[PDB]
């Protein structure tokens, strides 16, 4: 897979962010994770975590997987990087997202993220507390 440039338009919630990609505004849904909705436990902490990570970044990148690049709602499906660090993985490692929505052929980073979730669980962080 390949990282491509994007710039932040606006933080949305833990697992969605509005980015400009190839010069066009798009909402991106992070592959392979699920954060709690803003009204559920840890939803505001997940939203705040992502917001900080993308707002503080000097460089945002998006990396598509092998399969579908847009979902049924027109959201881009990608792994999102903030100064080289994957947001999807960071949320999982902190117990602020669960590995989820693992669809065959868009699942390159599945084992990297399950490894993070196992560590978050062992430490009883957040969702796993
Ligand atoms: C993360 C991801 C979500 N989706 C769809 C599945 C769910 O459909 P439903 O809307 O019918 O529940 C929805 C979950 O996204 P959200 O967790 O943002 O609500 O987005 C995909 O189709 N592909 C994916 O890779
Ligand atoms: Ca969600």
Give the residue, by CA position, lying nearest to ligand 1 atom 5: 71
- Nearest ligand to the CA atom of 29: 1
Known catalytic membership, residue 37: yes
Start-to-end CA distance of the chain, whole Å, equals 34
Residue 22 has phi, psi (to 5 degrees) of: 55, 35
Inter-residue contact 12 to 25 (CB < 8 Å): no
Known catalytic membership, residue 93: no
Residue that the structure tokens 């897979």 belong to: 1
Taking the C-alpha atoms of residue 117 and residue 111, their distance in angstroms, rounded to an integer, is 10
Domain residue limits at 104: 1-129
Residue from 50, 72, 76, 88 whose mutation best tests the ligand 1 pocket (most atoms within 8 A of CB):
72
Residue that the structure tokens 């994770």 belong to: 33
- For 27, the 3-state DSSP assignment is strand
Q: Per the structure block, which two tokens stand in for 54?
A: 């993308």
Known catalytic membership, residue 75: yes
Q: Per the structure block, which two tokens stand in for 15?
A: 């697992």
Taking the C-alpha atoms of residue 29 and residue 49, their distance in angstroms, rounded to an integer, is 15
Question: What was the structure determination method?
Answer: X-ray
Inter-residue contact 92 to 33 (CB < 8 Å): yes
Number of domains in the chain: 1
Give the residue, by CA position, lying nearest to ligand 1 atom 20: 71
- Nearest ligand to the CA atom of 75: 1
């Amino acid at each position: 897979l390949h990282k491509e440039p994007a710039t932040l338009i606006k933080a949305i919630d833990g697992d969605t962010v509005k980015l400009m990609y190839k010069g066009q505004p798009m909402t991106f849904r992070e592959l392979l994770v699920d954060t709690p909705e803003f009204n559920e436990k840890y939803g505001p902490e997940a939203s705040a975590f992502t917001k900080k990570m993308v707002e503080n970044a000097k460089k945002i990148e998006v990396e598509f997987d092998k399969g579908q690049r847009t979902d049924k709602y027109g959201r881009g499906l990608a792994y999102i990087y903030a100064d080289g660090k994957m947001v999807n993985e960071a949320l999982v490692r902190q117990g602020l997202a669960k590995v989820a929505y693992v669809y065959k052929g868009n699942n390159t980073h599945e084992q990297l993220l399950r490894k993070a979730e196992a560590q978050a669980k062992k430490e009883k962080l957040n969702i796993w507390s």
